[PDB]
Curated annotation (Swiss-Prot):
InterPro entries: Plug_dom (IPR012910), Plug_dom_sf (IPR037066), TonB-dep_rcpt-like (IPR039426), TonB-dep_rcpt_b-brl (IPR000531), TonB_box_CS (IPR010916), TonB_rcpt_b-brl_sf (IPR036942), TonB_rcpt_CS (IPR010917), TonB_sidphr_rcpt (IPR010105). Its main location: membrane. The lineage of its organism: Bacteria, Pseudomonadati, Pseudomonadota, Gammaproteobacteria, Enterobacterales. Residues 10-137 form the TBDR plug domain. It comes from Escherichia coli (strain K12). Residues 44-64 are annotated as: Disordered. Induction: Induced 1.9-fold by hydroxyurea. GO terms for molecular function: colicin transmembrane transporter activity; enterobactin binding; enterobactin transmembrane transporter activity; ferric-enterobactin transmembrane transporter activity; ligand-gated channel activity; protein domain specific binding; siderophore uptake transmembrane transporter activity; signaling receptor activity. A motif (TonB box) lies at residues 2-9. It is a multi-pass membrane protein. This protein is involved in the initial step of iron uptake by binding ferrienterobactin (Fe-ENT), an iron chelatin siderophore that allows E.coli to extract iron from the environment. FepA also acts as a receptor for colicins B and D. It is found in: Cell outer membrane. This is Ferrienterobactin receptor.
Length: 680
């Protein structure tokens, strides 16, 4: 019998908490400044700030199932992106990066895999929330190429516009060789410095001329090369090198005085930079035998050169991150008593950091370094014609933190009538950062929270993630309901109790483990082939629970439910159109302030449910030219950041900024856009 069973990894793409977005979907929904705009329309995915304090509220990233953006792991072609680790995390979880879903130009994406909960855990370190694996378009050995451009146009200028243009080339490079090359340039203007004027929370005294800043701008440059050697049947070697330069257009958190202040002297300048270099060597092999192997090595070098903000107690300060990842694995089809494919592998990862942070403040440390070594086995077993079980175990040894065991089990059972029952459970793993495990890494906050330092005795974060799903599927019909729950263990947050004062009576805290937190909810999907030419797709997500069991507070600020819906019409064979609709449930902020007291008055403001609609059309004029036009936010529904979620100062004193509650971000208004794709 020659029916091989698919690998556990492939099987897992069928888990109820996995979604795929195609190049076609991407081409019809042109992205402006970030592809997370399309990733967030998947069920169980939200766009939210790094910190539930509302700080850096206009820097939103992909959050999966309410676990927080920090818990989403991004891979490019299966390889982890560590770049975010060159920027230190703040006291409250804020992180001054643009996220990791903007390294790959949108037009270069073949497809996107979004894995959530149990399916995502096998990827190891960093996957507590989920995995977003970005797959690039591959070349075929013959000449092909593309030349594209995109730009939008906000009806309200305060809102920054985006322009993007890119190209790719691929072809034969000899006998057994080939190459792919692509380059990208994009620019997104920063929002106007006074965009939130007339919307700022109440403030006074030293804060009265201050305003909440809008979104910061960005400038991207990228170049990527790949050489592929197809030396044997089912045998290839692939060498990749790439380079990206990401720069900001400053606005900050309070780009606001009406005065010509420090905030206003930088507004629009590049004050922060990221240079990312990645190099990879990949060996994939196959045999008539059924056996496959995948072995690669990646070296990622990231430099963060930023102008520091504030003080303690224009010149760029740099931080360099080095990451080398080794990965090796074989897939063995096996006929024991039942058909099955055994996967066996190992990974080695080393990360080095070189800083320029000693901080007098009257702690000096040059490097940081850590290694993770891993072993893992997975098996995909075909128990019956309708029954599949995939058990797995991953072993991780972290150089500072020790051993971690991560078991997983996903089951799939056909129930007849094109109905399926699916369940999974897995233990996720996230190791603390070079920063959080370093006693030398300190942070001060005017307060006495006073000083916060590393902690070499931190446990890794862990998470038991579960899901049960029911799905009906056929002929373009799809209906599904999924229940999920994560019991999050040892989340690393700023500590809740001093560990002793200093040489002044000044209190010191550590990064520490929160014992328990929970996230629970429901996911639904509904696709209706309305007509041979008309499709209607929908997904809904509803949150039952989000909570840090230690503070009793929310883990992430997201809509209580989110509904996404697309209605598309294939009018001509070369012409389509679509309308897009999203509806958000209400957004409730934190319940308690920094000193554990109930949020009061303004700090408690919620955003009511709201919706945004878009329309767009794509016309393939020739098999070489495509034009796409659309408008986002058809009804111009807008939101403005009013400041951080909570009150700073004293409402009854002379100096203060009233809290914003959940109004921590700008939803941009009606916007026109156009896309021109040229290809062969």
């Amino acid at each position: 019998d020659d029916t091989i069973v698919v690998t556990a990894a492939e099987q897992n793409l069928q888990a109820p908490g996995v979604s795929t977005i195609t190049a076609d979907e991407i081409r019809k929904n042109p992205v402006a400044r970030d592809v997370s705009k399309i990733i967030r329309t998947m069920p169980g995915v939200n766009l939210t700030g790094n910190s539930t304090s509302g700080q850096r509220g206009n820097n939103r990233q992909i959050d999966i199932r309410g676990m927080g953006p920090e818990n989403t792991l991004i891979l490019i072609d299966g390889k982890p992106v560590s770049s975010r680790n060159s920027v230190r995390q703040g006291w409250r979880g804020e992180r001054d990066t643009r996220g990791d879903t903007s390294w790959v130009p949108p037009e270069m994406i073949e497809r996107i895999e979004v894995l959530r909960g149990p399916a995502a855990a096998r990827y190891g370190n960093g996957a507590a929330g989920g995995v977003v694996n970005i797959i690039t378009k591959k070349g075929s050995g013959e000449w092909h190429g593309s030349w594209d451009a995109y730009f939008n146009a906000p009806e309200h200028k305060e809102e920054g516009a985006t322009k993007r243009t890119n190209f790719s080339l691929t072809g034969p490079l000899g006998d057994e060789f080939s190459f792919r090359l692509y380059g990208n340039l994009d620019k997104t203007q920063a929002d106007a410095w006074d965009i939130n004027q007339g919307h700022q929370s109440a403030r006074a005294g030293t804060y009265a001329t201050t305003l909440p800043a809008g979104r910061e701008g960005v400038i991207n440059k990228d170049i990527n090369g790949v050489v592929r050697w197809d030396f044997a049947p089912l045998q290839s070697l692939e060498l990749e090198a790439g380079y990206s330069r990401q720069g900001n257009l400053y606005a900050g958190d309070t780009q606001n005085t009406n005065s010509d202040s420090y905030t206003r002297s930088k507004y629009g300048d590049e004050t922060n930079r990221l240079y990312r270099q990645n190099y990879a060597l990949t060996w994939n092999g196959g045999w008539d035998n059924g056996v496959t192997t995948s072995n690669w090595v990646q070296y990622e070098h990231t430099r963060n050169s930023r102008i520091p903000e504030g003080l303690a107690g224009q010149d760029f300060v740099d931080i360099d991150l080095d990451d080398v990842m080794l990965h090796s694995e074989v897939n063995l089809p096996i006929d024991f008593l039942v058909n099955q494919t055994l996967t066996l592998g190992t990974e080695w990862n080393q990360q080095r950091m070189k800083d320029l942070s000693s901080n007098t403040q009257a702690d000096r440390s040059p490097y940081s370094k850590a290694e993770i070594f891993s072993l893992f086995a997975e098996n995909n077993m075909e128990l019956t014609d309708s029954t599949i079980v995939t058990p797995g175990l991953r072993f991780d040894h972290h150089s500072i933190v020790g051993n971690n065991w991560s078991p997983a089990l996903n089951i799939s059972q056909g129930l007849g009538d094109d109905f399926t029952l699916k369940m999974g459970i897995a233990r996720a793993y996230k190791a603390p950062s070079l920063y959080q495990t370093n006693p030398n890494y300190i942070l001060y906050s005017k307060g006495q929270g006073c000083y916060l330092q590393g902690n070499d005795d931190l446990k890794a974060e862990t998470s038991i993630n579960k899901e049960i799903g029911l799905e009906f599927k056929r002929d373009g019909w799809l209906a599904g309901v999924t229940w999920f729950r994560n019991d999050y263990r040892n989340k690393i947050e700023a500590g809740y109790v001093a560990v002793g004062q200093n040489a002044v009576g000044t209190d010191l805290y550590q990064w520490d483990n929160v014992p328990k937190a929970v996230v629970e909810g429901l996911e639904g999907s509904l696709n209706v082939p309305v007509s041979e030419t008309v499709m209607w797709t929908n997904n809904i997500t509803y949150m039952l629970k989000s909570e840090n069991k230690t503070t009793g507070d929310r883990l992430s600020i997201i809509p209580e439910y989110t509904l996404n819906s697309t209605l598309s019409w294939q009018a001509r064979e070369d012409l389509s159109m679509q309308t897009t609709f999203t509806w958000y449930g209400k957004q409730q902020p934190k319940k308690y302030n920094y000193k554990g007291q109930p949020a009061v008055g303004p700090e408690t403001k919620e955003i009511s449910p709201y919706s945004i609609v878009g329309l767009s059309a794509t016309w393939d004029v020739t098999k070489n030219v495509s034009l796409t036009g659309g408008v986002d936010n058809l009804f111009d529904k807008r939101l403005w950041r009013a400041g951080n979620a909570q009150t700073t100062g004293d409402l009854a004193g002379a100096n203060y900024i009233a809290g914003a509650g959940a109004y921590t971000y700008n939803e941009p208004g009606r916007t026109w856009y156009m896309s021109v794709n040229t290809h062969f």
